[PDB]
Each structure stands twice: as structure tokens, then as C-alpha cells.
CSV table of C-alpha atoms in Angstrom, one decimal:
chain,number,residue,atom,x,y,z
A,1,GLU,CA,2.9,6.2,50.5
A,2,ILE,CA,4.3,3.1,49.4
A,3,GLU,CA,4.3,0.1,51.8
A,4,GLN,CA,6.0,-2.4,49.4
A,5,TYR,CA,6.8,-3.9,46.1
A,6,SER,CA,5.3,-6.9,44.5
A,7,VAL,CA,5.3,-7.9,40.5
A,8,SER,CA,3.3,-10.6,39.2
A,9,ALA,CA,2.7,-12.6,36.2
A,10,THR,CA,-0.8,-13.7,37.2
A,11,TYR,CA,-2.5,-15.5,34.2
A,12,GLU,CA,-6.5,-15.3,33.9
A,13,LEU,CA,-9.2,-16.3,31.3
A,14,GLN,CA,-12.0,-13.6,30.9
A,15,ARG,CA,-15.4,-14.2,29.6
A,16,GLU,CA,-15.8,-12.5,26.7
A,17,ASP,CA,-19.5,-12.7,26.4
A,18,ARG,CA,-19.8,-16.5,24.6
A,19,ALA,CA,-15.7,-16.2,23.9
A,20,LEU,CA,-13.0,-16.6,26.3
A,21,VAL,CA,-9.6,-14.5,26.4
A,22,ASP,CA,-6.5,-16.0,27.7
A,23,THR,CA,-5.7,-12.8,29.5
A,24,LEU,CA,-2.4,-12.8,30.7
A,25,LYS,CA,-1.2,-9.3,32.5
A,26,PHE,CA,2.0,-8.3,33.9
A,27,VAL,CA,1.8,-5.3,36.5
A,28,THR,CA,4.5,-3.7,38.0
A,29,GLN,CA,2.9,-1.4,40.4
A,30,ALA,CA,4.2,-0.2,43.8
A,31,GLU,CA,1.5,-1.3,46.6
A,32,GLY,CA,0.4,1.9,48.2
A,33,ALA,CA,-0.7,5.2,47.8
A,34,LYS,CA,1.6,5.8,45.0
A,35,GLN,CA,0.6,2.7,42.6
A,36,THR,CA,3.6,2.6,39.7
A,37,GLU,CA,1.4,1.1,37.5
A,38,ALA,CA,3.1,-0.3,34.2
A,39,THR,CA,1.1,-3.1,32.9
A,40,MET,CA,1.9,-5.3,29.7
A,41,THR,CA,-1.3,-7.2,29.1
A,42,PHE,CA,-1.5,-9.2,26.2
A,43,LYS,CA,-5.1,-10.6,25.8
A,44,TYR,CA,-5.7,-13.5,23.6
A,45,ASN,CA,-9.2,-14.5,22.4
A,46,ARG,CA,-8.8,-18.6,21.5
A,47,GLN,CA,-12.6,-18.8,21.1
A,48,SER,CA,-12.1,-15.8,18.3
A,49,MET,CA,-8.7,-16.2,17.4
A,50,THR,CA,-7.9,-12.8,18.2
A,51,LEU,CA,-4.5,-11.5,19.7
A,52,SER,CA,-4.5,-8.1,21.5
A,53,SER,CA,-1.7,-6.4,23.1
A,54,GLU,CA,-2.1,-3.7,25.9
A,55,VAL,CA,0.8,-1.7,27.9
A,56,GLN,CA,-0.1,1.6,29.8
A,57,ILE,CA,2.7,3.7,30.7
A,58,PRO,CA,1.4,7.0,32.1
A,59,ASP,CA,4.8,8.1,33.4
A,60,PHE,CA,5.6,9.1,29.4
A,61,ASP,CA,1.9,8.7,28.4
A,62,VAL,CA,2.8,5.4,26.5
A,63,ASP,CA,-0.7,3.6,26.5
A,64,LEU,CA,-0.6,1.5,23.2
A,65,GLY,CA,-3.1,-0.6,21.7
A,66,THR,CA,-2.4,-3.5,19.1
A,67,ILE,CA,-5.2,-5.5,18.2
A,68,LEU,CA,-5.2,-8.5,16.1
A,69,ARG,CA,-8.7,-9.5,14.6
A,70,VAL,CA,-9.1,-12.7,12.7
A,71,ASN,CA,-12.2,-13.9,11.0
A,72,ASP,CA,-12.5,-17.7,10.8
A,73,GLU,CA,-15.0,-17.7,8.0
A,74,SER,CA,-13.6,-20.3,5.5
A,75,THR,CA,-16.1,-23.2,5.0
A,76,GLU,CA,-16.0,-26.6,2.7
A,77,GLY,CA,-17.5,-24.5,0.1
A,78,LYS,CA,-16.5,-20.8,0.8
A,79,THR,CA,-13.2,-20.1,1.9
A,80,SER,CA,-13.0,-16.3,3.3
A,81,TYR,CA,-10.8,-14.5,5.9
A,82,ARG,CA,-11.1,-10.8,7.3
A,83,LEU,CA,-7.7,-10.1,8.5
A,84,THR,CA,-7.8,-6.9,10.5
A,85,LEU,CA,-5.0,-4.8,12.3
A,86,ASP,CA,-5.9,-2.1,14.4
A,87,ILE,CA,-2.9,0.1,15.1
A,88,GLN,CA,-4.0,2.3,17.9
A,89,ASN,CA,-1.2,4.8,19.3
A,90,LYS,CA,-2.5,6.3,22.4
A,91,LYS,CA,-5.9,4.8,21.6
A,92,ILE,CA,-5.9,6.5,18.3
A,93,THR,CA,-6.1,4.4,15.4
A,94,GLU,CA,-3.3,5.8,13.2
A,95,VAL,CA,-2.5,2.7,11.0
A,96,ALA,CA,-5.2,0.0,10.2
A,97,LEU,CA,-4.4,-2.9,8.4
A,98,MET,CA,-7.7,-4.4,6.7
A,99,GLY,CA,-7.8,-7.5,4.5
A,100,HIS,CA,-11.1,-9.0,2.5
A,101,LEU,CA,-10.7,-12.4,1.5
A,102,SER,CA,-13.5,-14.3,-0.6
A,103,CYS,CA,-11.7,-17.1,-2.5
A,104,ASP,CA,-14.5,-19.7,-3.2
A,105,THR,CA,-13.5,-22.9,-4.5
A,106,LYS,CA,-16.0,-22.8,-7.5
A,107,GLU,CA,-15.3,-19.7,-9.7
A,108,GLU,CA,-14.7,-16.5,-7.7
A,109,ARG,CA,-11.7,-15.9,-6.1
A,110,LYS,CA,-11.8,-12.5,-4.5
A,111,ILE,CA,-8.8,-11.4,-2.7
A,112,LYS,CA,-8.4,-7.9,-1.5
A,113,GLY,CA,-6.1,-5.7,0.7
A,114,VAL,CA,-6.9,-2.3,2.3
A,115,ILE,CA,-4.0,-0.2,3.1
A,116,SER,CA,-4.6,3.3,4.3
A,117,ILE,CA,-3.2,6.0,6.8
A,118,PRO,CA,-5.7,8.8,8.2
A,119,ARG,CA,-2.6,10.7,9.8
A,120,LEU,CA,-0.2,10.7,6.6
A,121,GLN,CA,-2.7,10.2,3.9
A,122,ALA,CA,-0.7,6.8,2.8
A,123,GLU,CA,-3.3,5.0,0.7
A,124,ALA,CA,-2.0,1.7,-0.9
A,125,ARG,CA,-4.7,-1.1,-2.6
A,126,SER,CA,-4.5,-4.6,-3.4
A,127,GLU,CA,-7.1,-6.4,-5.1
A,128,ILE,CA,-7.1,-9.6,-6.9
A,129,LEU,CA,-9.9,-11.6,-8.5
A,130,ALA,CA,-9.7,-14.8,-10.1
A,131,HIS,CA,-13.1,-15.5,-11.9
A,132,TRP,CA,-12.5,-19.7,-12.3
A,133,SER,CA,-13.9,-21.5,-15.3
A,134,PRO,CA,-13.8,-25.0,-16.5
A,135,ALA,CA,-13.6,-23.8,-20.7
A,136,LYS,CA,-12.2,-20.2,-20.6
A,137,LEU,CA,-10.6,-18.7,-17.7
A,138,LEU,CA,-11.0,-15.0,-16.0
A,139,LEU,CA,-8.7,-12.6,-14.2
A,140,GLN,CA,-8.1,-9.2,-12.8
A,141,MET,CA,-5.8,-7.5,-10.8
A,142,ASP,CA,-5.8,-4.3,-8.8
A,143,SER,CA,-2.7,-2.5,-7.2
A,144,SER,CA,-3.2,1.3,-6.8
A,145,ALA,CA,-1.2,3.6,-4.4
A,146,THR,CA,-1.7,7.3,-3.3
A,147,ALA,CA,0.5,8.7,-0.7
A,148,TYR,CA,1.2,12.5,-0.4
A,149,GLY,CA,-1.2,12.6,-3.2
A,150,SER,CA,1.6,10.3,-5.2
A,151,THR,CA,-1.2,8.9,-7.5
A,152,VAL,CA,0.3,5.2,-8.9
A,153,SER,CA,-1.8,3.0,-10.7
A,154,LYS,CA,-1.3,-0.3,-12.7
A,155,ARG,CA,-4.4,-1.6,-14.9
A,156,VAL,CA,-3.8,-5.0,-16.6
A,157,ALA,CA,-6.8,-7.4,-17.5
A,158,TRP,CA,-6.8,-10.7,-19.2
A,159,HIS,CA,-9.8,-12.7,-20.1
A,160,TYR,CA,-10.0,-15.9,-22.2
A,161,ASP,CA,-12.4,-16.7,-24.7
A,162,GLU,CA,-13.3,-19.0,-27.6
A,163,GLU,CA,-13.7,-16.2,-30.2
A,164,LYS,CA,-10.8,-13.4,-28.9
A,165,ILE,CA,-8.0,-13.4,-26.6
A,166,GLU,CA,-7.2,-9.9,-25.2
A,167,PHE,CA,-4.6,-8.4,-22.9
A,168,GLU,CA,-4.3,-4.4,-21.9
A,169,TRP,CA,-2.1,-3.0,-19.6
A,170,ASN,CA,-2.4,0.6,-18.0
A,171,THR,CA,0.7,1.9,-15.8
A,172,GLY,CA,-1.4,5.3,-14.3
A,173,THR,CA,1.3,7.6,-12.4
A,174,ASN,CA,0.5,11.1,-12.3
A,175,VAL,CA,2.0,13.4,-9.8
A,176,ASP,CA,0.6,16.7,-9.5
A,177,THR,CA,2.8,19.6,-8.6
A,178,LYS,CA,-0.3,21.7,-6.4
A,179,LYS,CA,-1.6,18.4,-4.9
A,180,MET,CA,1.8,17.2,-3.5
A,181,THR,CA,2.5,21.2,-2.0
A,182,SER,CA,-1.3,20.7,-0.4
A,183,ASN,CA,-0.8,17.3,0.5
A,184,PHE,CA,2.7,17.4,2.0
A,185,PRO,CA,3.0,19.8,4.8
A,186,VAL,CA,5.6,22.3,3.2
A,187,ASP,CA,5.3,24.7,6.8
A,188,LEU,CA,7.1,23.8,10.1
A,189,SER,CA,5.7,24.6,13.1
A,190,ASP,CA,8.7,26.4,14.4
A,191,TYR,CA,10.2,28.3,11.6
A,192,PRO,CA,8.5,31.8,10.9
A,193,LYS,CA,9.2,32.2,14.4
A,194,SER,CA,12.7,31.5,14.4
A,195,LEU,CA,12.9,33.8,11.5
A,196,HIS,CA,11.2,36.7,12.7
A,197,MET,CA,13.2,36.5,15.6
A,198,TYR,CA,16.4,36.2,13.7
A,199,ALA,CA,15.6,39.0,11.8
A,200,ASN,CA,14.8,41.2,15.4
A,201,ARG,CA,18.4,40.2,16.5
A,202,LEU,CA,20.0,41.3,13.2
A,203,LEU,CA,18.1,44.6,13.4
A,204,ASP,CA,18.6,45.3,16.9
A,205,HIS,CA,22.2,44.9,16.8
A,206,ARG,CA,25.3,46.3,14.8
A,207,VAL,CA,28.6,47.9,14.6
A,208,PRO,CA,29.0,51.0,16.9
A,209,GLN,CA,30.1,54.6,16.1
A,210,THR,CA,27.4,54.1,13.5
A,211,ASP,CA,23.7,53.1,13.4
A,212,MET,CA,23.2,51.5,10.0
A,213,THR,CA,22.5,47.3,10.2
A,214,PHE,CA,23.2,44.8,7.9
A,215,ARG,CA,19.8,44.7,6.5
A,216,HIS,CA,20.3,48.1,4.6
A,217,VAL,CA,23.3,46.5,2.6
A,218,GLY,CA,21.3,43.1,2.0
A,219,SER,CA,18.6,45.3,0.2
A,220,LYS,CA,21.0,46.9,-1.6
A,221,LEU,CA,22.6,43.4,-2.5
A,222,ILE,CA,19.4,42.0,-3.5
A,223,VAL,CA,18.3,45.0,-5.5
A,224,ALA,CA,21.7,44.5,-7.8
A,225,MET,CA,21.2,40.8,-7.8
A,226,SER,CA,17.6,41.7,-9.3
A,227,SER,CA,18.8,44.0,-11.5
A,228,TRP,CA,21.1,41.8,-13.0
A,229,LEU,CA,18.8,39.0,-13.0
A,230,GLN,CA,16.8,41.5,-15.0
A,231,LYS,CA,19.4,42.4,-17.4
A,232,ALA,CA,19.7,39.0,-19.2
A,233,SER,CA,16.6,37.6,-21.2
A,234,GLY,CA,13.5,35.2,-20.2
A,235,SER,CA,10.2,36.7,-19.4
A,236,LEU,CA,8.5,34.2,-17.1
A,237,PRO,CA,6.3,34.2,-14.2
A,238,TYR,CA,9.1,32.4,-12.2
A,239,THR,CA,10.8,35.5,-12.4
A,240,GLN,CA,8.3,37.4,-10.8
A,241,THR,CA,7.7,34.8,-8.1
A,242,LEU,CA,11.4,34.8,-7.6
A,243,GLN,CA,11.4,38.8,-7.4
A,244,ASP,CA,9.0,38.8,-4.9
A,245,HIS,CA,11.0,35.7,-2.7
A,246,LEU,CA,13.8,38.2,-3.2
A,247,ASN,CA,11.9,41.2,-1.7
A,248,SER,CA,10.5,39.0,1.3
A,249,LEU,CA,14.1,37.8,2.0
A,250,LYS,CA,15.5,41.6,1.8
A,251,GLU,CA,14.2,42.0,5.6
A,252,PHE,CA,15.9,38.4,6.1
A,253,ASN,CA,12.2,36.5,7.1
A,254,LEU,CA,10.3,33.7,5.0
A,255,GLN,CA,7.7,31.6,5.7
A,256,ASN,CA,8.4,28.3,4.0
A,257,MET,CA,11.7,25.9,3.8
A,258,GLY,CA,13.5,26.4,0.2
A,259,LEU,CA,11.8,28.3,-2.8
A,260,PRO,CA,7.8,28.4,-3.4
A,261,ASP,CA,8.3,28.7,-7.0
A,262,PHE,CA,7.3,25.6,-8.9
A,263,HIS,CA,8.8,25.6,-12.4
A,264,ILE,CA,7.6,22.3,-13.5
A,265,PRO,CA,4.5,22.2,-15.1
A,266,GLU,CA,1.4,21.5,-12.3
A,267,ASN,CA,0.1,18.0,-13.7
A,268,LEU,CA,3.0,15.6,-14.5
A,269,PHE,CA,1.5,12.9,-16.4
A,270,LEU,CA,3.1,9.6,-16.9
A,271,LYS,CA,1.0,6.9,-18.8
A,272,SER,CA,2.0,3.9,-20.7
A,273,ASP,CA,-1.3,2.5,-22.5
A,274,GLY,CA,-1.1,-0.6,-24.5
A,275,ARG,CA,-2.9,-3.7,-25.2
A,276,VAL,CA,-2.9,-7.2,-26.9
A,277,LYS,CA,-5.8,-8.2,-29.3
A,278,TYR,CA,-5.4,-11.6,-30.3
A,279,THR,CA,-8.5,-13.3,-32.6
A,280,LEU,CA,-9.0,-16.9,-32.6
A,281,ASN,CA,-11.9,-16.7,-35.4
A,282,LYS,CA,-14.7,-17.8,-33.5
A,283,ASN,CA,-14.0,-20.9,-31.6
A,284,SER,CA,-11.6,-22.4,-28.9
A,285,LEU,CA,-10.5,-26.1,-28.4
A,286,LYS,CA,-11.1,-27.2,-25.0
A,287,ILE,CA,-9.5,-30.7,-24.4
A,288,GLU,CA,-10.3,-32.6,-21.5
A,289,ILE,CA,-7.4,-35.2,-21.2
A,290,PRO,CA,-8.2,-37.9,-18.3
A,291,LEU,CA,-6.1,-38.0,-15.4
A,292,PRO,CA,-5.6,-41.4,-14.1
A,293,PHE,CA,-5.3,-41.9,-10.1
A,294,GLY,CA,-7.0,-38.3,-9.5
A,295,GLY,CA,-9.8,-36.9,-7.0
A,296,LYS,CA,-7.7,-38.0,-4.5
A,297,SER,CA,-7.7,-36.2,-0.7
A,298,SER,CA,-4.9,-35.8,1.7
A,299,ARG,CA,-5.4,-38.9,3.4
A,300,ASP,CA,-4.9,-41.0,0.4
A,301,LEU,CA,-1.4,-39.8,0.2
A,302,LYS,CA,-0.1,-41.7,3.1
A,303,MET,CA,0.4,-38.6,4.9
A,304,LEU,CA,-1.3,-37.2,8.0
A,305,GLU,CA,-3.2,-33.4,7.4
A,306,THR,CA,-2.1,-32.1,11.1
A,307,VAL,CA,1.3,-32.9,12.3
A,308,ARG,CA,1.3,-33.4,16.4
A,309,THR,CA,4.6,-33.5,18.0
A,310,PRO,CA,5.3,-35.9,20.7
A,311,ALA,CA,4.0,-34.2,24.2
A,312,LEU,CA,6.7,-34.7,26.9
A,313,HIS,CA,5.6,-34.6,30.3
A,314,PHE,CA,8.2,-36.0,32.5
A,315,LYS,CA,7.9,-35.3,36.1
A,316,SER,CA,11.4,-36.9,37.1
A,317,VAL,CA,12.5,-33.4,35.9
A,318,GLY,CA,9.3,-31.1,35.4
A,319,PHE,CA,9.5,-31.0,31.6
A,320,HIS,CA,6.4,-29.9,29.8
A,321,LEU,CA,6.1,-29.8,26.1
A,322,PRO,CA,2.4,-29.7,24.7
A,323,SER,CA,1.6,-31.0,21.0
A,324,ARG,CA,2.3,-28.6,18.9
A,325,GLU,CA,-0.4,-29.0,16.1
A,326,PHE,CA,1.1,-27.9,12.6
A,327,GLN,CA,-1.8,-27.7,9.5
A,328,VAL,CA,-0.6,-29.0,6.4
A,329,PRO,CA,-2.2,-26.9,3.4
A,330,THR,CA,-4.5,-29.3,1.5
A,331,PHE,CA,-4.4,-29.7,-2.3
A,332,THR,CA,-6.8,-32.0,-4.4
A,333,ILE,CA,-5.7,-33.8,-7.6
A,334,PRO,CA,-7.7,-32.8,-10.5
A,335,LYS,CA,-9.5,-36.1,-12.6
A,336,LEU,CA,-9.3,-33.9,-15.7
A,337,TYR,CA,-7.4,-31.0,-17.2
A,338,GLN,CA,-8.6,-28.5,-19.4
A,339,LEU,CA,-6.3,-27.5,-22.1
A,340,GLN,CA,-6.4,-24.6,-24.6
A,341,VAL,CA,-5.5,-25.2,-28.5
A,342,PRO,CA,-5.2,-21.8,-30.3
A,343,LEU,CA,-5.9,-21.2,-33.8
A,344,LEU,CA,-4.7,-18.5,-36.4
A,345,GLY,CA,-5.0,-14.9,-37.0
A,346,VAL,CA,-5.5,-11.9,-37.0
A,347,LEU,CA,-3.5,-10.4,-35.2
A,348,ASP,CA,-3.3,-6.8,-34.0
A,349,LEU,CA,-1.2,-4.8,-31.1
A,350,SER,CA,-1.5,-1.2,-30.3
A,351,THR,CA,1.0,0.8,-28.0
A,352,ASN,CA,0.5,4.5,-27.2
A,353,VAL,CA,2.7,6.7,-24.9
A,354,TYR,CA,1.6,10.1,-23.1
A,355,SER,CA,4.4,11.6,-21.1
A,356,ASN,CA,4.9,15.0,-20.6
A,357,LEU,CA,4.8,17.2,-23.6
A,358,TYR,CA,5.1,13.4,-25.6
A,359,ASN,CA,2.0,11.9,-27.1
A,360,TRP,CA,3.4,9.1,-29.1
A,361,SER,CA,1.0,6.7,-30.9
A,362,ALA,CA,1.3,3.3,-32.9
A,363,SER,CA,-0.7,0.9,-34.6
A,364,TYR,CA,-0.2,-2.5,-36.1
A,365,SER,CA,-2.5,-4.8,-37.2
A,366,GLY,CA,-0.8,-8.0,-39.1
A,367,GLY,CA,-1.9,-11.4,-40.2
A,368,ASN,CA,-4.4,-12.4,-43.5
A,369,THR,CA,-7.9,-11.0,-42.4
A,370,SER,CA,-9.0,-13.9,-44.1
A,371,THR,CA,-7.5,-17.4,-44.1
A,372,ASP,CA,-10.0,-19.0,-47.3
A,373,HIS,CA,-10.1,-15.6,-48.9
A,374,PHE,CA,-6.3,-14.0,-48.6
A,375,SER,CA,-7.2,-10.6,-47.9
A,376,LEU,CA,-3.9,-9.2,-46.6
A,377,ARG,CA,-3.6,-6.0,-45.0
A,378,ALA,CA,-0.6,-5.6,-42.7
A,379,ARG,CA,-0.7,-1.7,-42.0
A,380,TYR,CA,1.5,0.4,-39.5
A,381,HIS,CA,1.9,3.8,-38.3
A,382,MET,CA,4.1,5.4,-35.8
A,383,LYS,CA,3.3,8.8,-34.6
A,384,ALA,CA,5.3,11.1,-32.0
């Protein structure tokens, strides 16, 4: 069926509509009726900065598809990109990594990140925005992560203003018991069958010269220990769930791993509230310090923008070394500096903690409410 073998590393250049794919394939098949196809192809779209990797191995059904799509959307006044990592296992997208960037150079600086897993429910967020402003400054942050129903949040926002300056923080972390139980697979594909077969083996095998099996003594011991448990104090539904578990265990057959009883509260909340309120009366001070020798571009630093190594083509020894072009991140020198000069009070803080069965509140606003009228009210409060 196979007349011979041949392995090749032929490089081709595919016509992707308008774009060109530097398709390099490494097939290792056997010539003849029996094709031992095992090809490691790694496509590259140089016209669209797209990298792909293909490996088909039907011997173990290994058909992995890795596609790296990069969108060049950066312009002279709008720097943007769309990073995409599509991890397909057996052509099934199981890990996807998408990034959205709209970091403009004028006011808006949108930085985003998408992290989710369709198979295991592992959703994570990373979104950054920073609204540029010559006078004030506006900035935000987003970083959320939910995996198996583990809700984690962090909400911190700060904004500058001539009147007031505010700064809050919110560390959200709530993990629910039933949500964990449902999201996390708590049942094994091969476990109830094993328990049933173990119970069958235990029942269908015992000492001779008699017919009682160990299940009778096991039920006796479960009854005795249940009687001892109910002998002591404590009237909770967890005890009744335990009794049901014991009755099920009497036959030596369960449904899941461990103990289904959940003594913890179904809602497990843990939050750290807090803020900063910082008054600057009504106006701020925006000093525009002149910066001499400013506004220069990359070429004025006596440095090159792109580093190009000497391409070495020596025919005597056949040495080939192309020009590796390295891009130096550009930076522009500001001509003026915006400096914010603050003012006096009023000052105020508040922070509240909400842990499980714990609601602690605090509030204090110090500082004279009026500089020119001397109305001081520095009152605090602590509640738990």
C-alpha cells in the first residue's frame, strides 16, 4: 500500500483574497494507498499580521488549530488594535482571548481585555479607561473575574475637578454556596456505578456457615451512631441532612463525593466599602509651566526610529542574515506642564465593612467648614 516515504518542508505563498499567507507546511505522509498524514502547517498572513498554526494528527485525533488575529488599527491620531487569540481544540474554540484597544492620543484612552472560557466558565475582565484632559484628569479601572461562580470585583474610580476631588474604592467579592455547588461539577461520571457495584459485591459475598452479610452490621452501627448523635444537643437541619446521608450510607451507596450538607450560609458576602471626599472649595489652580526645548520628535534625539541590523550575505560560506527591523517606541516631549495646586478643606472620609454577620459603619468629616467664618464640626461615629 505504501511504495515509499517522503518528508518535505515546501514553503508556499497562498492568495488570501487580497492578502498573502506565508504558508509553510511540513507533511510526513507515506506515499501510496496508506497516507500517514501528519502535517504541522504554520500559516502567516504578512499582509494582515495574522499568525496561524495547524497540526492534524488523526492517529490520536489531534487536530489543533491556533489562530492569532491581530488588527492594525493605529493611525496618527487614533491608535487602536484588536488582539485575538482563538484556541480551538479539535477545531472547538475552548479558550478565546480578545483585546479591544482604543487608546486615542487626545482625550479617550480605551484599554480593554476579554478573558472567558466557554467550557469551564472562567470569565475575567480587564478594562482600563483614562479620559485625558489638559485642565483636570479622568481615569477609571475595571477588573472583574468570575470562575465557577466566584464573583470578584474591584470598583475604584478617581476624578479630578476644580471644585471637588473624590476617590472611592469597592472590593466586591461574593461567593454563593448553591452557586458554587451548581457551577462546579460535583458529580463524577464514574462513581455512582462504582458504589452500586461495590454494594452488590458486599451483599453477594459473606462468610460461610451463615447468611448474614456485613450490611446488617453496618446498618446497626449507623443506627447506633445516629442515636448517639441525637442523644446530644443541637437541633439544626444539617443534622437531618446528616441523618439522610447516614440512611443512604447504610446500603453503602452514595451519589457524590464527600458530604452534600452545607453548614455555611448560602450567601457568603465580603465587601470593603470606602471613599475619599476631598473638597477644594470651588476652583483649582492649573499652572502651565513652560518647558523649553520641547515638542521634539524622535529624529531630533540624534537617534534612529527603527534599528536595522547589518544584513550579511556572504557567498563564500553561504551565510544569510536579513535585516531585523526593531521598532523603538516613540515619545513626544511636552511643551508645557499642567500642575495642579490644591486648596484647604473641608475634608471627609467614610468607610464601611460588610463581612458575613458583620456590618461595621464609620464616618468622619474633619476640617473647618468655613475658613472665613470658623464653623468647625469634626464629628465621628463608629458602629459595629
